[PDB]
Symmetry: C3
């Protein structure tokens, strides 16, 4: 349970960083 | 358990939206 | 529990593929 919460959080962190990288790419492809 | 399922689903939703944004960027960088 | 671990892993896999696609876009927007 605690390790599963850990694993969920590792995913949440990866998502957070992906969102920020995507946002950078979005800006660079934008007019 | 139910809240953990919730949290997993919040991640799944964030991923879904990231995938669609990535796809938009992929198209805009494509020839 | 086992299915929840499954679901977490489905998210981890989606994230992995998103990270690689983002990286491709990052390179294509880079100088
Ligand atoms: Cl997750
Ligand atoms: Cl992207
Ligand atoms: Cl993601």
């Amino acid at each position: 349970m605690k390790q599963l919460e850990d694993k969920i959080e590792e995913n949440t962190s990866k998502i957070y960083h992906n969102t920020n990288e995507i946002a950078r790419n979005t800006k660079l492809v934008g007019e």
